[PDB]
Design an enzyme around this catalytic site. Structure first.
Site, short mmCIF file in Angstrom:
data_model
loop_
_atom_site.label_atom_id
_atom_site.label_comp_id
_atom_site.label_asym_id
_atom_site.label_seq_id
_atom_site.Cartn_x
_atom_site.Cartn_y
_atom_site.Cartn_z
N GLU A 99 0.82 -1.20 0.00
CA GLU A 99 0.00 0.00 0.00
C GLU A 99 0.86 1.26 0.00
O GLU A 99 0.70 2.14 -0.85
CB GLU A 99 -0.97 -0.02 1.19
CG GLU A 99 -1.97 -1.20 1.09
CD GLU A 99 -2.39 -1.77 2.44
OE1 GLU A 99 -3.53 -2.30 2.54
OE2 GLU A 99 -1.58 -1.72 3.39
N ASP A 151 -5.85 -3.22 -2.06
CA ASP A 151 -5.83 -1.78 -2.27
C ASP A 151 -4.47 -1.30 -2.79
O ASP A 151 -4.41 -0.48 -3.71
CB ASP A 151 -6.29 -0.98 -1.04
CG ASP A 151 -5.38 -1.15 0.16
OD1 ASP A 151 -4.79 -2.23 0.36
OD2 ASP A 151 -5.37 -0.22 1.00
#
Length: 337
Positions: free
Chosen positions: A32, A93
């Site tokens: 991330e 993500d």
């Protein structure tokens, strides 16, 4: 030059291209973090940083190649003084921000290499952490392993920004369906106007929206409001999502700050969110005065060198507030270079 990004690099990005959270004794890097670094470097037109961050990511998170595997989500110091992957599972993500950033870098810098890597990454995300869920259709799991079992799935509403979902539709299935099912995830799991950090779905039984420990809007879900705010005003979905999440805007307007935690089942709010939560409000709040109240909090309490999480939220939220980037109606980067 994007001054906050320059200071971010100094504070948090090594010469070798790894993004570091120094609040942790392990001095960790995540997929991330790498992905946000890559996004911000592209937004800043900072190709040297982009390349260096991509290089470190491929070598250290993907055993040499993002074309061959999703990046390990967690990397850092082990007990024996060794620095290595600490968890080989993916975090989707990171994966999607990373794919989007590569595809947009390829388009905007006219480099086929970025396109090729971003395309192979995106296809692998679809193969490896998208599944068909009865009653929903295609859904994006939060990671390769551990979020799906027989008849039950766990999702993270903050993981796929609507602008990214729009962008990916250009690639056909499953992204064409995922745009719609992502809308369903955002809209159907916020019965009191607040999006949960995490939420489960069970076959036939449906969304599990009775009060439970992680069914709260806190450190993950704060990004949902921010992604919605970054949608172009022309997009009719935006109005619909602004309406759904109005009680977050209302709390923040009335109280002068965003809450730390909100019970998703009841709408009961507690505490005062940190400065990064105020930055997340900047794109989201539509009222000029309330926006200015949050702007002041971010300006006067701007994150320093040991405040990684708040600084990341601030790059996005204050960045948008200062026109450091925009998204098109098709989910493309409209750079401010």
């Amino acid at each position: 030059t994007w001054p906050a990004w320059e200071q971010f690099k100094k504070d948090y990005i090594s010469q070798e291209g790894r993004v570091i959270d120094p609040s942790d004794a392990r001095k960790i890097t995540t997929s991330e973090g790498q992905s946000y670094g890559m996004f911000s470097a592209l937004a800043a037109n900072d190709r040297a940083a982009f390349d260096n961050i991509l290089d470190w990511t491929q070598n250290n998170l993907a055993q040499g190649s993002l074309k061959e595997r999703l990046p390990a989500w967690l990397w850092g110091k082990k007990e024996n003084s060794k620095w290595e992957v600490l968890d080989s599972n993916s975090a989707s993500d990171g994966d999607v921000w990373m794919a989007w950033s590569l595809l947009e870098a390829g388009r905007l810098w006219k480099e086929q290499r970025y396109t090729d890597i971003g395309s192979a990454l995106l296809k692998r995300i679809a193969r490896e952490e998208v599944v068909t869920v009865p009653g929903l259709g295609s859904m994006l799991l939060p990671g390769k392993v551990g979020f799906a079992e027989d008849n039950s799935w766990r999702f993270n509403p903050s993981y796929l920004p609507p602008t990214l979902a729009q962008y990916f539709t250009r690639f056909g299935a499953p992204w064409t369906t995922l745009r719609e099912t992502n809308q369903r995830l955002l809209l159907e799991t916020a019965p009191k106007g607040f999006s949960p950090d995490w939420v489960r779905y069970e076959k036939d039984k449906g969304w599990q929206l009775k009060a439970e420990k992680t069914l709260i809007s806190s450190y993950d879900a704060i990004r949902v409001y921010m992604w919605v705010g970054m949608m172009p005003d022309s997009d009719p979905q935006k109005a619909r999502m602004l309406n759904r999440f109005k009680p977050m805007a209302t709390f923040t307007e009335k109280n002068g700050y965003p809450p730390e935690k909100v019970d998703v089942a009841t709408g009961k709010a507690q505490g005062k969110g940190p400065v990064g939560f105020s930055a997340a409000m900047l794109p989201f709040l539509q009222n000029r005065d309330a926006q200015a109240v949050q702007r002041q909090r971010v300006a006067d309490n701007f994150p320093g060198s040991d405040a990684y999480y708040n600084y990341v939220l601030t790059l996005f939220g204050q960045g948008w507030d200062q026109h450091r980037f925009r998204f098109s109606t098709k989910g493309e980067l409209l750079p401010d270079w």
